[PDB]
Amino acid sequence: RKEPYYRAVQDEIELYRAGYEARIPMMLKGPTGCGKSRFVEHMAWKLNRPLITIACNEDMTASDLVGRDGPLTVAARIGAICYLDEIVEARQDTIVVIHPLTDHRRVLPLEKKGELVEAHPDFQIVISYNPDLKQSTKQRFGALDFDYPKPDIEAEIVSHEAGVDKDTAEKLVQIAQKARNGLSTRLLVYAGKLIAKGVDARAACTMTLVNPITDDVDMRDALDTVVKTFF
Amino acid sequence: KEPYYRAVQDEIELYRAGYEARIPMMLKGPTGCGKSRFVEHMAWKLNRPLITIACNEDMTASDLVDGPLTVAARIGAICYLDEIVEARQDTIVVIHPLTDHRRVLPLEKKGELVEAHPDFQIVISYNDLKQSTKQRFGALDFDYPKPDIEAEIVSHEAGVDKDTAEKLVQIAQKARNLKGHGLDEGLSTRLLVYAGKLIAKGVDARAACTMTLVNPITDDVDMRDALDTVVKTFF
Amino acid sequence: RKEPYYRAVQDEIELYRAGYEARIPMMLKGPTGCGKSRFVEHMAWKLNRPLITIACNEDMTASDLVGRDGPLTVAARIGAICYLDEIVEARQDTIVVIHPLTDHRRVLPLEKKGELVEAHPDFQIVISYNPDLKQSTKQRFGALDFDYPKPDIEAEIVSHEAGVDKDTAEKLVQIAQKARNGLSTRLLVYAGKLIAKGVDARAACTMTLVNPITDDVDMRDALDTVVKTFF
Amino acid sequence: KEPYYRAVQDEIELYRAGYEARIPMMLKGPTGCGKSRFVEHMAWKLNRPLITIACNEDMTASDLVDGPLTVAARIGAICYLDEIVEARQDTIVVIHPLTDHRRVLPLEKKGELVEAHPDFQIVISYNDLKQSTKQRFGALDFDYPKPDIEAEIVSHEAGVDKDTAEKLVQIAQKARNLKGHGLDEGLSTRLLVYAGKLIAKGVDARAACTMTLVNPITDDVDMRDALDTVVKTFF
Amino acid sequence: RKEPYYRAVQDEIELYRAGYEARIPMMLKGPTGCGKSRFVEHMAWKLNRPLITIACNEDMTASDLVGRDGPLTVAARIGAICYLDEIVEARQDTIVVIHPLTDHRRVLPLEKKGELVEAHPDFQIVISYNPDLKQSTKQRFGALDFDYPKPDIEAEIVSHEAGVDKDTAEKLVQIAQKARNGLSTRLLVYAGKLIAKGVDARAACTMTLVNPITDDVDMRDALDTVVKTFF
Amino acid sequence: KEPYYRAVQDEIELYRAGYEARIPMMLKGPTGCGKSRFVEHMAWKLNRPLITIACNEDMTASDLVDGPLTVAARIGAICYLDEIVEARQDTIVVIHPLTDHRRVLPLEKKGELVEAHPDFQIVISYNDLKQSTKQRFGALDFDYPKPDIEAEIVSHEAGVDKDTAEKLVQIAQKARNLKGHGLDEGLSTRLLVYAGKLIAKGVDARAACTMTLVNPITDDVDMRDALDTVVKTFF
Ligand SMILES: Nc1ncnc2c1ncn2[C@@H]1O[C@H](COP(=O)(O)OP(=O)(O)O)[C@@H](O)[C@H]1O
Ligand SMILES: Nc1ncnc2c1ncn2[C@@H]1O[C@H](COP(=O)(O)OP(=O)(O)O)[C@@H](O)[C@H]1O
Ligand SMILES: Nc1ncnc2c1ncn2[C@@H]1O[C@H](COP(=O)(O)OP(=O)(O)O)[C@@H](O)[C@H]1O
Ligand SMILES: Nc1ncnc2c1ncn2[C@@H]1O[C@H](COP(=O)(O)OP(=O)(O)O)[C@@H](O)[C@H]1O
Ligand SMILES: Nc1ncnc2c1ncn2[C@@H]1O[C@H](COP(=O)(O)OP(=O)(O)O)[C@@H](O)[C@H]1O
Ligand SMILES: Nc1ncnc2c1ncn2[C@@H]1O[C@H](COP(=O)(O)OP(=O)(O)O)[C@@H](O)[C@H]1O
Fold first, then answer.
1. At F30, which helix (H) or strand (E)?
2. Is the same domain home to A45 and A59?
3. Which of B13, B157, D205, F76 is most deeply buried (CB count within 10 A of its CB)?
4. Does residue C131 have a cis peptide bond before it, meaning omega lies within 30 degrees of 0?
């Protein structure tokens, strides 16, 4: 596995490491595209552990999770980090399935199969939360508070991923900063990456910063005035 | 193999560089405005295979995931998923790991994980979707072409002379003017095409416009005659 | 196939013929029992083409349409006219299935089977619409505006189908005309057909014109006053 | 084989000619008023086989379509579909091509199309249905028979003397008077039957009427004693 | 089969016996735990007849009832008493399935199997109703009006089932009587049975009379004042 | 094999006699207050096998009914069904004949009826359920233990000294005070445990309390700093 590029905003990586070894289930909280998913993949490799990602949604059922085997069960048998992305989207009654894996009992009853699986001692559930869950689900997790990084830091992230000089990346950040009166950092990476293809700066921002997020016209010409301030 | 497409703006070059960065694109705009044909033109201009998916609700994970979306990932082909919003959401999130820096779709159950070809790109069409999904895309905004260009397209697609096409656009122009004033959506370019070809076959122009431009988009009688008023002035 | 009796009210039959040969999908719009279904069957035989009828409803799914093969697919392979009656009743997300058959692309992706079918060059979709659909579905169709025919004409239709003299048929029409302050022409055919069995004229109308349509009592004795005007 | 039926109106002759024209009939009216028994009497009087279908929601297309509805089409038998409104709607529309001038049900999947026998007729029962379906039927309106006739039926069905039957109808009469004033629906003839036969077996008439005429139709206590007041006057 | 202990409150047992032999379907109406289910089992054995109980619920379907064979069908073939407990809870469209068994026609169409079953001449449907059904379902049944028995009688029932002296049972009844400003008689049996285990009288009532029924705090200290009146 | 449990009240003796009468018990109270561990302690103290069921919605009749609930009936073991309300209702009513005087579960389809062992007991957990089901149970009301006892539990479970545990409880005390004033539910004992063990591993106590006591239960910022104020006073 190649190492995923994650730039630490604060002390979130040792808090996770501490939390991981300490048996406790982790919850990541923040807006869209603030590096939550990437953080997991960075910790998954840094701790030298397998990674299984689950894109949760409103139509996902329990048997999609445990099997008919399923991702959650596989993640339980082999020592893997099970990342339930977008936990809010999923039906909240399909998530109580993970409850036998989150407290001191660490097993998964596949009562359709008549089997009680072992939880590989190196197993942990991490979930993504933006920005509702049950209290019997919330209060079984430790929580990290993620957010869009400091302007200097985000500018470093954009330049590294999109492939543009600092001066352009700072402008993308300053535009984005005022744009969130959330707006994914990935959209800034897209914008810069387009500029790295000889695309008009405003057009690059129009494609990524004003069009994918809102279909309100007078919205756009409020964000396309702030793009014209810097670019 | 160039499919007929007339650019209204910088969409051809913007999508070009948009593909050069392998960025997931979203085509936004009204129905029948050239979105589905724009992809074909770019798939030809960028010189690469194209796989089209018509998204409905009875489209499970399996059929999207031997799977067409999986095929475009192997070959390195532009994957155009038309009308994504209609598809149930356990599909919309299937494309999520293909929108990451990873470039990878998980062929679970069946076996291995699939790392996509460097020439692969995912394209969707859009007028719901979550902000988690919308912000994974770059976006181009399509609207009905200006009278000059639109008439050229109609004339070419309908097989009618320039004069007839201009009048058809003129009718469509007077009808798009009425959105929020009686129409849920202005007149499509597709219906403009539909009209000229009835005319190109000898059908009375007033009748041809009635069954393609007036009737399909309106049930209200007093504003349907308003469109009929327009037709009787240009034809 | 025996020819279905269709009496032309105006220029709807050459407009369909013109529209058919011209690749465009047709939509029939009008009240219940104004001869929409019959018109299709008349055009189906007159153009010497196979006919597949689909009774759309709120519980009909896409796999009921394309197959698990289905009617729509069969209609696509062999050169047939696929008539989707009562298109408003069906779930509007199950109808976007026909979209790949209605524009210039003319195919049907059976992604459950891994097959892309050819559209037999003599294939067309016609739908029944009373009196909502998506704009992405509406604006792919040409539309004919059907309605209950002129009094003289409907009287001819009733006499031909029910089997009664003109004088009785005119009365059924005049009653119906004022009854629609819709009311199917078929109910008039039923009424006359009962009169052709030695049934009291008012009783024949009571069974067909006032009872099947409304369960409001004071409604009935408003329609049973107009039946007593003519009969 | 004549099943016991007493005509309240011209329903027997109206249905007779209604069948002679092979017209789809609908029986409208309250529950337990003789609708399901009227069909049997006519199926006997018109001298023809009869197939009855009890429509619920777990009645797919297959079970209606070797299928009973298909059987009546082959043989030429009156097909009585009881409580149509309860059935899911992909069934209600199965009968549509059998209500046309065609007289034909499509046995799709399995094979051929099925042209029905000239002696076939479809009958439904009704107190929802679309106007597209309701206007495919002729309709007869059933209501509870007038005191003279109703008592004769009760006496015959219950096996009680004329005097007892009249009082039971009298109780039912005073209860149908209260609809919109405390009762969702008046007292059925079926419950009137139920009462006499408890009485025909030696059960105290006040108790017999209580568990058949009062209790099954009312939960409200102060109007339940209102019905109990009626019972204690005739019994 | 051992005889179930049922104490007759009034003339409900001969009315059932009379109703049973007289072909008519029976309905039991009353609050929770007033001896409705027990009454059926008492009549089932006293009439020397097999008994099949069905716990109706909002997710129960028709095929759960008739088979895929099912309980209702089995109860129809062999001469058994089919007891549909909690009929209000079930989907009311899944219960019209029993309609062909409740009138003079006594059959069950398994149209999925292509079979019309005989109704064993000794077959009857009894249902539990607390305290809505369709009129086409209601008016096919005879109805018995059950209720919590007279204080003297209920005290006899508690002493017999729980195993406590009269004086304790009367107190449980008097507490319960005022508690229903329903409250199951079974909760009184539980309370006394706990007292028969050396449990504090108020604690025994707290576990059964104030805690299982309400989660309102100021409710509890209104019922725990009346428990302190007698105990 | 005694699992660590500290009694807050008479729950151990009340459940003891509650089992001696073979009465179905319900454990009521907030999440993470020791309900699931109380059963284990009693299953050990009463000297008998224990089968635990985690109830979700995709738990049909079959998996509850070779079935664990059936197993506890044969063996004579306490059957703890955790979070019953989450389970679909055709399961909640499966336990109904096991709550009667009969003591019997019907293994239908598969065959015979199953009479349970005299040592069998059914236990559920609860904070919906019908009154028909709730009144089939005896009930014990659990709440978070008083500061003395709670700190002892935290200290034991967290592996921290008495002083640290008391402060953690103090923080939890100041947070349970805020329910109805900004919090949907007070701080669990489980999160109190979670905090001490980060501290028992060298994590900064202010950070440890932040990610276990503050962050998991609050999204509102101005009252999240209110909890942060509390943390900065005790740590
Ligand atoms: N430390 C970081 N903070 C913020 N964004 C980052 C960081 N490191 C990488 N990114 C970029 O953010 C983009 C989106 O992050 P993502 O994993 O989608 O966040 P989320 O899971 O919260 O949506 C990635 O493409 C990545 O390049
Ligand atoms: N450059 C163009 N701009 C607009 N419309 C065009 C252009 N070229 C062709 N068309 C016509 O406009 C119609 C647009 O419909 P299509 O692109 O197939 O679906 P949609 O636009 O809804 O994705 C086509 O029928 C086509 O004949
Ligand atoms: N030209 C016509 N106009 C109106 N009604 C007609 C015509 N020709 C036949 N009919 C009669 O109308 C009846 C109902 O027509 P139908 O096909 O049900 O219309 P729809 O499909 O709009 O409900 C048929 O039984 C037919 O006999
Ligand atoms: N001519 C009649 N009119 C009214 N009721 C009758 C007549 N003949 C018999 N009955 C009795 O009335 C009851 C009507 O119920 P039934 O006809 O079976 O169901 P429904 O009337 O709801 O279709 C029957 O139980 C029958 O005993
Ligand atoms: N005659 C009676 N009246 C009231 N309760 C009784 C009677 N006989 C027994 N019981 C007790 O009532 C308890 C609950 O009765 P149950 O069958 O649950 O009533 P329901 O079916 O109305 O809920 C039983 O445990 C039984 O011991
Ligand atoms: N006697 C006790 N009272 C309260 N909490 C306890 C006790 N003993 C242990 N605990 C701790 O409290 C937590 C309670 O969670 P648990 O009992 O497993 O779930 P729940 O209480 O939600 O059923 C456990 O993690 C356990 O470490």
1. none
2. yes
3. B157
4. yes
E63 labeled part of a ligand binding site: no
Question: Residue written as tokens 């289905």?
Answer: C70
Instruction: Please check whether residues E138 and E219 belong to one and the same domain.
Output: no
The whole-angstrom separation of Cα D80 and Cα D63 is 15
Q: Cα(A166)–Cα(A160) distance, rounded to whole angstroms?
A: 9
3-state secondary structure of E3: coil
> To test the ligand 2 pocket, which listed residue (B8, B37, B150) has its Cβ within 8 A of the most ligand atoms?
B37
Whether omega before E131 lies within 30 degrees of 0, making that bond cis, reads: yes
- Between CA D193 and CA D189 the distance in angstroms is 6
Q: Which two tokens stand for residue F45?
A: 């103290």
Look up residue B166 and give its amino acid.
E
Residue at a domain's end among C146, C171, C202 = C146
Conformation bin of residue A125: beta by default, left when phi > 0, alpha when psi is -120 to 50: beta
- Give the separation between CA B59 and CA B57, rounded to whole angstroms: 5
**How far is it, in rounded angstroms, from Cα F124 to Cα D162?**
60
β-sheet with C26-29: strand ranges across: C51-55, C81-85, C124-129, C26-29, C142-145
Residue with tokens 């096409």: B165
**Given E71, E186, E207, which is nearest F140 (Cβ)?**
E207
From C105, C123, C146, give the residue that closes a domain.
C146
* Cβ neighbourhood burial of C104 (10 Å; 0-12, 13-18, 19+): exposed
Please name the member of D54, D185, D211 whose beta carbon is closest to the beta carbon of E109: D54
Tokens read off for F202? 């060298």
Query: In whole angstroms, what is the distance from residue A89 CA to residue A129 CA?
Result: 9
Same domain, C60 and C155: no
**Sequential DSSP letters for A177-190:** HHH-----HHHHHH
Q: Token digits for E175?
A: 């507490």
User: Quick check: helix, strand or coil at residue A31?
Assistant: coil
Amino acid at C47: L
Chain B residue numbers with beta carbons less than 8 Å from the beta carbon of C103 are 36, 190
C-alpha to C-alpha distance for E39 and E12, rounded to whole angstroms: 9
Residues C116 and C174 in one domain: no
One domain for residues B40 and B106: yes
- Three-state DSSP state, B211: helix
Distances (CA, A) of E146 to A12, D215, E127: 65, 11, 13
Asked whether D134 and D176 are in contact (CB, 8 A), the reply is: no
Residue A33, Ramachandran bin (φ over 0: left; ψ between -120 and 50: alpha; else beta): left
Query: Cβ–Cβ of A211/B108 closer than 8 Å?
Result: no
> What is the interface size between D and E, counted as CB pairs within 8 Å?
99
Residues E133 and E151 reside in one and the same domain: no
Helix (H, G, I), strand (E, B) or coil at E196: coil
Amino acid at F17: A
Rounded Cα–Cα distance for residues A172 and F112 (Å): 72
In degrees, rounded to 5, the angle at the alpha carbon of residue A68 between the alpha carbons of residues A65 and A73 is: 45
Distance CA E211, CA F137 (A): 10
Name residue, tokens 């004769």. D152
Place of tokens 């999925």: E112
Q: Give residue F71's region: left, alpha or beta (phi > 0; psi -120 to 50).
A: alpha
* E217-227: b (≥16 Cβ within 10 Å) or e: eeebeebbebb
Interface test with E, best of F11, F65, F132 (most E CBs within 10 A): F132
Domain count, chain F: 2
Whole-number Å distance between alpha carbons of A158 and A187: 10
Q: Is beta strand F121-126 parallel, antiparallel or unpaired with respect to F25-28?
A: parallel
- Tokens encoding D24: 């789809």
Q: Which domain holds residue F27?
A: 1-142
Residue C13: name the closest of C49, C33, C40 by CA: C40
Torsional class of C28: left (φ above 0), alpha (ψ -120 to 50), beta (otherwise):
beta
